[PDB]
Write a protein that binds this ligand. Structure first.
Ligand SMILES: CCCCCC(=O)SCCNC(=O)CCNC(=O)[C@H](O)C(C)(C)COP(=O)(O)OP(=O)(O)OC[C@H]1O[C@@H](n2cnc3c(N)ncnc32)[C@H](O)[C@@H]1OP(=O)(O)O
Lengths: 160, 482, 154
């Protein structure tokens, strides 16, 4: 998170578009990461994406769960174009952790695909992987004149 | 049908939304020793000031009113604030689309008029039943935290088990306040940790108030009970402006125009012996009105102090090295605790008052491999970027990089005064260098004063600097190390 | 000893502010002139003067303050910045320490937006310091120019 966060804020400061290739199970839980502050330090990546105003294209190759999906250049966090491969899995959780809240599991493959997210317009395209380059290139071309306003402030108060 | 029928029908829906639902939720949260969402709002807000919004919102597809959250605005000590409060009894407090809509609306209002947002959390995070949609709304909320950052004060009360987005949004707000025994914070709960990683940990070991108040740093304060937490938040708001444009409150004061006994005591507070320590709070209290201050992160990085007080009725931010813990050295934790504090205060135009007694940085493999260079430099960045008035009082040790960082003149402090016990040098030990007079010769300190004049000089410096204005770099934002 | 260190500060304070004022009055009254401090007390409201860089010294006699009294105070309740040359000490000549002290209070006045009164009484440039004395004259001039029409200058 800290590696990618400062990378993104840097690129946003010098107007380099950010292209995200996403396949994320989520944030890493467990006592090691909590006592070291994963809650506020992993969220630095969220701040970085939402703060940025450069064009942002996202390709979802496979896993897209929970906070990982939110942070990794989702549409709601400010991505201009979100395209998904058919192998994309967009859900709040994996089926192994969501269903011990009722093998009524592979009916949780309601979510094992991108088509619910596509139904709500949370992804813009469901493409064959071979068209990725094509679709990235034109998306980047379409976004070069993007302009976005920024909050009126001395500076924000990013978690430290 | 009739007009009277429709008005009686509205009264009936309102009894079900506010009375019946509340009694049901009180019964189920009694199982856990907790108050209800509405009870918490009534403890927080001025009596009779609460205006509830979206009372009759329901999920689309049992569809209770509110979908598990109570939103609205009110006043705290006469000034307007916006509030939302999770209902853990409805689906574990998880956010669905109706839930998220209510929160998104209340945040949009607070951004629109520029008042603080108090979020009262008691939630499992994102509602699994709604899939992508719940994640979408929590992201909208987090985006609004980010666009609010440094624009309106944001305060989170953690008052139950909290996971996922229910800890992610608080982390983006300015202050997180937990409550003893009843609250927790983790990415995901202990049973998911067991099924996935799989470690066998108790909730208190994984993310209890003590873990976050003393180890991770995620909690700025832990209240003994809910009302203690809520009372802390009310006191905190009493120091802060509503937004980053309008001024902080000014209270009247009983400060003494001459020199008192408490001022004279500062002349004897520093021990004669260098390996004897003292309590920096004994210095802090002699300067601040009524000797009072609200301390941020009191149980975390106790080798530095961060507090808000008042000088002549004006809000003042205090950063001070505490010699009673780890000799008052700087480590990673003290650096990041004071760094974020200073940046918050600079965002909201609170002047920073620094008491320096710093022998240097904590040495060791633990510090160096855990990133003391890029994490400790955050305090340097915080000071150098700030434009608020900065006054620094140097009481004793002031060596090397520690001297540089703690609000020296060169890093941008507007006023630096030194006590005769101050030792400003590259390193210690020949004690013709054990004083502030080489620094005073170069002008690096502006004044060498008897300690008892501290309160008098600080008060006059702050007043001299109320109209300070300083230009900022032309940029979208900086690139502070993370 | 802490009490010793405070006592020592009291001693140096009196060689910088009190005794130097006696010697400076003795030599300037001979010429029908007041001293830098007495002029500051005539200018500012009683008890409002806050003196800065009292113990500044030049680098290479190294008197405290290097020949200029600087600080801020009030005139009829409103804030002003002030500097006052001490013609007795080192001729009131422009050195690097001297110029630093005046630059500091000019930066302060530009920072907080208050007028600056400068009381001039000077034999010119400290020649031993060479081009540095020029460098600091120029620095002050530039601050006069960036202040021009922004804060009043007397
Ligand atoms: C600011 C940045 C925002 C970013 C946005 C994001 O990325 S959001 C990240 C995405 N993922 C998350 O937020 C999920 C994190 N939450 C979790 O992992 C889990 O919910 C948990 C750790 C709280 C486990 O809670 P438990 O159910 O074991 O606790 P408990 O048994 O007391 O809960 C009682 C009731 O609440 C239900 N419940 C609890 N959490 C729920 C949830 N998240 N969604 C739906 N239902 C939930 C349970 O079904 C149960 O219902 P019944 O009593 O009726 O049986």
């Amino acid at each position: 998170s800290e590696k990618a966060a400062r990378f993104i804020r840097f690129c946003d400061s010098f107007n380099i578009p950010v292209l995200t290739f996403m396949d994320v199970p989520g944030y890493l839980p467990g006592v090691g990461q909590e006592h070291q502050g994963i809650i506020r330090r992993g969220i630095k990546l969220f701040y970085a994406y939402a703060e940025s105003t450069v064009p942002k294209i996202t390709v979802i190759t496979r896993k897209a769960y929970g906070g990982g999906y939110a942070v990794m250049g989702s549409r709601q966090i400010g991505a201009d174009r979100v395209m998904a491969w058919p192998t994309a899995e967009i859900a709040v959780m994996g089926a192994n952790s969501a269903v011990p809240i009722l093998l009524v599991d592979d009916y949780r493959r309601r979510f094992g695909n991108p088509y619910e997210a596509a139904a709500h317009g949370y992804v813009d395209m469901v493409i064959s992987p071979s068209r990725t380059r094509y679709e990235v290139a034109r998306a980047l071309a379409s976004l070069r004149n993007k302009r976005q306003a920024r909050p009126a402030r001395k500076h924000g108060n990013i978690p430290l | 049908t009739s007009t009277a029928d429709r008005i009686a029908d509205l009264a009936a829906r309102h009894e079900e939304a506010v009375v019946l639902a509340e009694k049901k939720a009180a019964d189920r949260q009694h199982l856990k020793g907790k108050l209800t969402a509405r009870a918490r709002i009534d403890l927080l807000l001025d009596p009779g000031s609460f205006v509830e919004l979206d009372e009759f919102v329901r999920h689309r597809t049992p569809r209770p009113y509110g979908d598990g959250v109570v939103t609205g605005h009110g006043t705290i000590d006469g000034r307007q604030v916006c509030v939302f409060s999770h209902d853990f009894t409805t689906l574990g407090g998880s956010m669905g689309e109706a839930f998220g809509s209510k929160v998104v609306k209340i945040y949009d209002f607070a951004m629109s008029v520029g008042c603080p947002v108090i979020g009262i959390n008691d939630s499992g995070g994102a509602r699994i039943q709604e899939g992508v949609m719940s994640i979408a709304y929590y992201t909208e909320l987090g985006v609004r935290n980010v666009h609010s950052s440094g624009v309106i004060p944001q305060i989170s009360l953690i008052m139950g088990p909290c996971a996922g987005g229910s800890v992610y949004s608080p982390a983006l707000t300015d202050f997180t306040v937990m409550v003893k025994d009843i609250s927790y914070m983790f990415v995901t709960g202990p049973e998911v940790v067991s099924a996935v990683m799989g470690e066998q940990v108790t909730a208190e070991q994984l993310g209890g108030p003590a873990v976050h108040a003393e180890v991770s740093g995620n909690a700025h304060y832990v209240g003994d009970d809910e009302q203690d937490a809520i009372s802390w938040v009310q006191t905190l708001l009493g120091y802060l402006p509503p937004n980053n444009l309008d001024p902080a409150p000014v209270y009247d004061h009983d400060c003494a125009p001459g020199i008192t006994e408490a001022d004279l005591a500062l002349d004897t507070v520093i021990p004669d012996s260098e390996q004897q320590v003292y309590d920096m709070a004994d210095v802090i209290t002699a300067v601040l009105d009524d000797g009072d201050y609200l301390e941020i992160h009191p149980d975390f990085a106790r080798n530095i102090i961060c507090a808000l007080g008042r000088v002549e009725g004006h809000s003042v931010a205090v950063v001070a090295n505490q010699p009673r813990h780890l000799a008052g050295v700087l480590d990673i934790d003290a650096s990041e605790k004071a760094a974020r504090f200073i940046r918050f205060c600079d965002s909201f135009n609170i002047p920073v008052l620094t008491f320096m007694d710093v022998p240097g940085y904590l040495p060791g493999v633990g510090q160096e491999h855990q990133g003391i260079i890029r994490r400790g430099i955050k305090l340097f960045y915080a000071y150098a970027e700030s434009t608020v008035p900065k006054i620094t009082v140097i009481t004793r040790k002031a060596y090397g990089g520690g001297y540089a960082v703690m609000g020296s003149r060169q890093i941008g402090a507007d006023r630096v005064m030194a006590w005769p016990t101050a030792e400003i040098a590259v390193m210690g030990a020949r004690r013709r260098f054990g004083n502030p007079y080489e620094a005073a010769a170069h002008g690096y300190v502006d004044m060498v004063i008897s300690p008892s004049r501290t309160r008098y000089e600080v008060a006059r410096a702050l007043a001299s600097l109320r109209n300070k204005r300083q230009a900022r770099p032309a940029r979208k934002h900086g690139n502070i190390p993370l």
